[PDB]
Design a protein around this ligand. Structure first.
Ligand SMILES: [Mg+2]
Ligand SMILES: [Mg+2]
Ligand SMILES: [Mg+2]
Ligand SMILES: [Mg+2]
Ligand SMILES: [Mg+2]
Ligand SMILES: [Mg+2]
Ligand SMILES: [Mg+2]
Ligand SMILES: [Mg+2]
Ligand SMILES: [Mg+2]
Ligand SMILES: [Mg+2]
Ligand SMILES: [Mg+2]
Ligand SMILES: [Mg+2]
Ligand SMILES: [Mg+2]
Ligand SMILES: [Mg+2]
Ligand SMILES: [Mg+2]
Ligand SMILES: [Mg+2]
Ligand SMILES: [Mg+2]
Ligand SMILES: [Mg+2]
Ligand SMILES: [Mg+2]
Ligand SMILES: [Mg+2]
Ligand SMILES: [Mg+2]
Ligand SMILES: [Mg+2]
Ligand SMILES: [Mg+2]
Lengths: 70, 149
RNA sequence: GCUUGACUGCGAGCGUGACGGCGCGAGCAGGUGCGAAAGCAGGUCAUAGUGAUCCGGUGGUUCUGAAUGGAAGGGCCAUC
RNA sequence: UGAGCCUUGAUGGAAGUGUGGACGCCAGUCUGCAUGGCUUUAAUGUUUGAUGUUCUAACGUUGACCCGUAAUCCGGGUUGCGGACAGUGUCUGGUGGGUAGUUUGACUGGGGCGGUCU
RNA sequence: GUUUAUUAAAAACACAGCACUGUGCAAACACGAAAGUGGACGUAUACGGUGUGACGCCUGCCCGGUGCCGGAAGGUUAAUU
RNA sequence: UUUUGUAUAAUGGGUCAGCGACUUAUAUUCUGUAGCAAGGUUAACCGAAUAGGGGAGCCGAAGGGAAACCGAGUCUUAACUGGGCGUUAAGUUGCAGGGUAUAGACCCGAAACCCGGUGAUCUAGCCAUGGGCAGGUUGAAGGUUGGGUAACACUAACUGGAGGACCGAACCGACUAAUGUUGAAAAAUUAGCGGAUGACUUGUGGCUGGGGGUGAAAGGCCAAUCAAACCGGGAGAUAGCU
RNA sequence: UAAGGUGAUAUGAACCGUUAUAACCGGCGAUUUCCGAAUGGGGAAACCCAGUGUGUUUCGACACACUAUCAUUAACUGAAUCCAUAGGUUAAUGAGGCGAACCGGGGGAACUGAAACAUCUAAGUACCCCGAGGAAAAGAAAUCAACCGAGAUUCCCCCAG
């Protein structure tokens, strides 16, 4: 639902089996928190994988320079 | 798998490993409160003004303490007698002071911490060899001559 | 006894089916076997011993192959 | 404790007396240690997979205490306990009338039973 | 005592009692996409589910089949590399 | 009307008046008719709008072969034979009609499925807060005292006052028969009947929602509706049947 | 603009007007109770109750006016913890709710057809939810073509059933 940094998903989809199943799939992503910002001190954003992998190449600031303003 | 500790901590790296390091280990320990590291361009080169300015001594700093043997060689004949007497011996003491202090002719000054003479100087008077032992990177030469009085 | 006609390519004209289809067939072309030769042989005396289509598998062929040369894939022939 | 690269080892400073591990076509040699004048394969370095140990630092806490606050919620903080477990996401083997969608032929002296469908 | 309001009041349901079985508490279990709530402001002399149905004398043999409980050495075996 | 067959005692209609079912759109193919002719004809659009312009394009004058390809020939085969399909058949575009196709497709009609809302003012449970139960009976536990025991049990009276206890109005419920059955009444009346201090009964308000609830369990109840409520929608569901 | 005129079901009464502020029509205003996003708090809608300010004031009352919640910014205050934050107050803006269809987007059936039915169909239709405009959306090639070239998106007719 969150994964703040990056969008998320929670988008539906039909899960077929052997030929077809008109069922439905959905809930995905992950979660975690407590990210120590070198600045003042850590707020616990609820990002997930890909979201957490993002704060890597990026910063920890820029990655928050958005969740903040905007 | 890229960080810059510089403050080695049991890790297979010191001064900040610039080559493949551990990953996921710093996300919540090393980097936070411990030793920030992000070995990503910006941070990387930033270590230069912290390390690349320590080896420049072999040219800049050395030049300010390497010309020893050059600055002092044609030195004025050090005529610091050591009390020549005793039917052919002396009384004066030849060791550290008289040797190093044998330069303040005009007024210059030094220290008795740069000498190269394993054996204690015999109480003679002949051409006293004083190979100035400033730094390991550079040596020098000085002389001393005892006189009667 | 000798052999491989249980051949390959076609087929006048017929019989029987709503149709799909099924059956009979002299004769022609290339090459065979048996007979001295006329000639006989296109599986078994005949009539049951069978499964359409699709989706594919195998071999053959320059039929085709999405810019072009190939290729994959498709067709065609044989067959599971 | 496996396995890779491959690093040092056994095949393809100077005699004599002994000790250990090696193996047998066996009657034996190999190989470290005092006094005496490339691959078949092992060890350490390491790379990575295994189980098992412990730690804190992600993570949990329906334990305590401090504020927001004359709140049982929630958040932050301190502290304790648990700990890379648990649990969650993707994928994957089970099980799955809990639920759901359906099928379950025809002929026939009614239908069903029996029998038959070329 | 309860039940088919409007054709069935019963031998049917319930009952107290009994037995098996699960649950160590953030309990099992249930409602709920979740948060959260019930269980219970209870905690194994407790709570849930199943069967039997005061009480009396009792409750025999079978574990082959199916289910469940334990073991898990060996065979087969998913994603994954 | 339906049937082999109906005066049939097989179906439908009390009667009259009004309404009530082969339509429509585009596509395709025949027939008639009109235009033009190896050619016929435009679409959108422009527009000095039913003109005129626009020939993108559609169909026909060539077919054969799976195709490359060849071509009044072409496939077939090694075949240059024969055999299959073709070759001195006029088509094309409107208009009207017959049929077909996609559509609700002549009209009326299901039992149902799915989606979203409305319903616990009936009823089933449960929660909170209030109320009701004339009278009469039996008479447990406990206790007082006498007895009695070393002390108790045990006992006898008196007191005591329990109980899903007894009889019986209110109140609650429904076992039987008669009547009612176009009823007084879409479940009642009359005479009997069961419970009636209890798992009792009742007022007020609240909480559970449909594949869901509640259920001392009958598939019972969830507003005269329940093997899946009511209302609106998908919707002209589908109906080889009448 | 004008001789008539005071809306209608029915006049009638009492009246206004004829020259140029009587009507009547159009524009801009004034007013505009209570409920309703309803916004001071509550509430079985059109009712109940309060705080803080006002002037008229016999100077008790009167009614009036403001006081919802969020978001942005500003200033002031400000915890555990020096700090700083969390939080608090105030104030200026703005939002909130209605709305027929078309439009973008999130979620998404079944009857039905296949002469049964699971793949498939119905159909991304029904419906529900969110958003915006006057249109929305899309939009200036990491497009297509085929060795020639075209040249953003959108809509129409062909290609073709
Ligand atoms: Mg025979
Ligand atoms: Mg079923
Ligand atoms: Mg169906
Ligand atoms: Mg039958
Ligand atoms: Mg009874
Ligand atoms: Mg009944
Ligand atoms: Mg009865
Ligand atoms: Mg029983
Ligand atoms: Mg038994
Ligand atoms: Mg008849
Ligand atoms: Mg009749
Ligand atoms: Mg009539
Ligand atoms: Mg011919
Ligand atoms: Mg009683
Ligand atoms: Mg009575
Ligand atoms: Mg009684
Ligand atoms: Mg009530
Ligand atoms: Mg009812
Ligand atoms: Mg429909
Ligand atoms: Mg209908
Ligand atoms: Mg108000
Ligand atoms: Mg209000
Ligand atoms: Mg069907």
């Amino acid at each position: 639902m969150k994964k703040d940094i990056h969008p998320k998903y929670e988008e539906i989809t039909a899960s077929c089996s052997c030929g077809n199943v008109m069922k439905i799939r959905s809930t995905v992503g992950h979660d975690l928190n407590l990210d120590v910002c070198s600045k003042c001190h850590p707020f616990f954003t609820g990002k997930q994988r890909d979201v957490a992998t993002g704060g890597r190449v990026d910063r920890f600031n820029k990655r928050f320079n958005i969740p903040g303003s905007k | 798998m890229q960080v810059i500790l510089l403050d080695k901590v049991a890790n297979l790296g010191s001064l900040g490993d610039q080559v493949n390091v551990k990953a996921g280990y710093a996300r919540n320990f090393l980097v936070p409160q411990g030793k920030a590291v992000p070995a990503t361009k910006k941070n990387i080169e930033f270590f230069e003004a912290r390390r690349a300015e320590l080896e420049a001594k072999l040219a800049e700093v050395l030049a300010a303490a390497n010309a020893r043997a050059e600055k002092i060689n044609a030195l004025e004949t050090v005529t610091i007698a050591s009390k020549a007497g005793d039917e052919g011996k002396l009384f004066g003491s030849i060791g550290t002071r008289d040797i190093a202090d044998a330069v303040t002719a005009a007024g210059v000054e030094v220290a008795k911490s740069e000498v190269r003479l394993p054996n204690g100087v015999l109480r003679t008077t002949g051409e006293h060899e004083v190979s100035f032992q400033v730094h390991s990177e550079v040596f020098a030469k000085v002389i001393v001559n005892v006189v009667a009085e």
